[PDB]
Amino acid sequence: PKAESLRRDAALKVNVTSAEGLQSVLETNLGPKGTLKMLVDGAGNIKLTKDGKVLLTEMQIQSPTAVLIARAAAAQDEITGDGTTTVVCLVGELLRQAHRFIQEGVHPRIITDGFEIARKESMKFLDEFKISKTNLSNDREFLLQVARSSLLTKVDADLTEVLTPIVTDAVLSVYDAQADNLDLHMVEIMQMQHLSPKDTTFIKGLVLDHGGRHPDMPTRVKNAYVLILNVSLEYEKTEVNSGFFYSSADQRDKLAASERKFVDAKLKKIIDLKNEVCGMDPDKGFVIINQKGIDPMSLDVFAKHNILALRRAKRRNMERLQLVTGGEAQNSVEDLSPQILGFSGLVYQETIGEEKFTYVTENTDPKSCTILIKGSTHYALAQTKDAVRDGLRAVANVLKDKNIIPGAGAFYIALSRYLRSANMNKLGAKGKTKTGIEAFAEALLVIPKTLVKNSGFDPLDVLAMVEDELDDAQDSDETRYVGVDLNIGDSCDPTIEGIWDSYRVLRNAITGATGIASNLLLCDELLRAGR
Amino acid sequence: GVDIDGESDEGVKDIREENIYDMLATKKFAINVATEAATTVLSIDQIIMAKK
């Protein structure tokens, strides 16, 4: 005779409790006032990243509840690319607000169905709250303050002014004005140590790994022709099998020079191309790419003509050089044509004993960009790279989608106020739906309270000043947006400050966090099987 | 400056007499490194490692 109502509550509470521990960890690092987390494997891998999705991939969690939280950000990084920590804060806080309602006897289906109703009503208020921005290219001045939203989060704000023109000029230079799209794969990121992070500068062309080493090479070459050389200039052998037979060491040089005539014969046609077109004209140069190796004999030959010698080039980087420079790949020297030469500007090579980089920059139509992130320590390379990749993907949805939303908790506070007064006027859902809407409205107010909590200002005072300001704006018959100012502690105008978030980022954040958090409360029992 | 003492009578003396000074390139560059070194420690509120 066993019939149990004791199945009301179960490990679901532990599922909510396990989510509370993950919330307190990711509550401190949210926003520009957050903290920089550090994880160490013990084998020498040290990475400092404030992003939530990046850290969860290096940490295994036995609790299956936190597994879906990390998997919910998989669609966010591949589409939105920003707000992974904010989505987690909305999933964890919503479980705490619903914890009090579960103990009172409220069935979780009404709690779950009440979130989907408020989510559909939030999309209607989202279209009126958004602001459509034109696609004109004169908005670059406005895009500077928008790009700072993602930059100020991952750094201390001292390096934001340095990376601001680099991120802005990277996308707009290769993007013609139309609908189209933008591709971030063409932007390559390289790193070199023994330098300060404040030396980061923008690179228009492509950076090359192995540079030429010789004291007589010209430092600066203006208006030079780029020529792809596919033939190997290293030591070569006779096309048929043979051997070197010499009685004395003097006779060996006669047989060794016979195989070297094949390389010297092709070098005579290369040096004639320089003097053929603008040989004696000033501000002219001739640069050889030569992806393959270089023999030591050509070092003195190319130095007298001031020809840049390069070797050991990456195969992937050669495909971009054809687009930037325009010169086609020349396999044979006999087939070389004067039209193969491309166009380039001033090329200067920095002299460093460890490495030497060649700048392909200053081109008419490069159609490519390179962001060079250099730092002395290990964490400086990983931290800055995380802010650049998050900054490029945040602006990616700004140029594609003409709609823009103000950040700094502008939409989270406004939506909670609209859904509060709209539920009493409609009353078309159900009387028990108020438990789900009130819990959803209070779950959206944690984001503005989380940002101010890390700054030290009282979250209770900032909440009262915003609610009192919105009431006076309705009676004044105007439209005034209110936002949380973390530095001063009072309210602020998000249009003047310049804090803006993309439409697609916050659209999938509210929708994504609603479905994942609702599915957590749907678990009746945790079963362990398969072993 | 800070005198080693152990001699003379009492007090300190001019450090320029012994031609001892700190180069500005050493001191100015050390300030930027000292601030960034303590900033990382104070910015990390949690650490997670494994037993080794």
From Swiss-Prot, chain A:
The lineage of its organism: Eukaryota, Fungi, Dikarya, Ascomycota, Saccharomycotina. It comes from Saccharomyces cerevisiae (strain ATCC 204508 / S288c) (Baker's yeast). Pfam families: Cpn60_TCP1. One of its GO terms (molecular function) is ATP hydrolysis activity. It is found in: Cytoplasm. NCBIfam families: chap_CCT_zeta (TIGR02347). The modification Phosphoserine is found at S242. CDD domains: TCP1_zeta. PROSITE patterns: TCP1_1, TCP1_2, TCP1_3. Heterooligomeric complex of about 850 to 900 kDa that forms two stacked rings, 12 to 16 nm in diameter. Its main location: cytoplasm. InterPro entries: Chap_CCT_zeta (IPR012722), Chaperone_TCP-1 (IPR017998), Chaperonin_TCP-1_CS (IPR002194), Cpn60/GroEL/TCP-1 (IPR002423), GroEL-like_apical_dom_sf (IPR027409), GROEL-like_equatorial_sf (IPR027413), TCP-1-like_intermed_sf (IPR027410). GO terms for biological process: chaperone mediated protein folding independent of cofactor; protein folding. The gene is CCT6. One of its GO terms (cellular component) is chaperonin-containing T-complex. Keywords: Acetylation, ATP-binding, Chaperone, Cytoplasm, Nucleotide-binding, Phosphoprotein. This is T-complex protein 1 subunit zeta. Molecular chaperone; assists the folding of proteins upon ATP hydrolysis. Known to play a role, in vitro, in the folding of actin and tubulin. In yeast may play a role in mitotic spindle formation. The keyword tRNA processing does not apply. The keyword Membrane does not apply. Gene3D superfamilies: GroEL (3.50.7.10), GroEL-like equatorial domain (1.10.560.10), TCP-1-like chaperonin intermediate domain (3.30.260.10). Belongs to the TCP-1 chaperonin family.
Curated annotation (Swiss-Prot), chain B:
Heterooligomeric complex of about 850 to 900 kDa that forms two stacked rings, 12 to 16 nm in diameter. The modification Phosphoserine is found at S8. Molecular chaperone; assists the folding of proteins upon ATP hydrolysis. Known to play a role, in vitro, in the folding of actin and tubulin. In yeast may play a role in mitotic spindle formation. Belongs to the TCP-1 chaperonin family. The gene is CCT8. It comes from the Eukaryota. This is T-complex protein 1 subunit theta. It is found in: Cytoplasm.
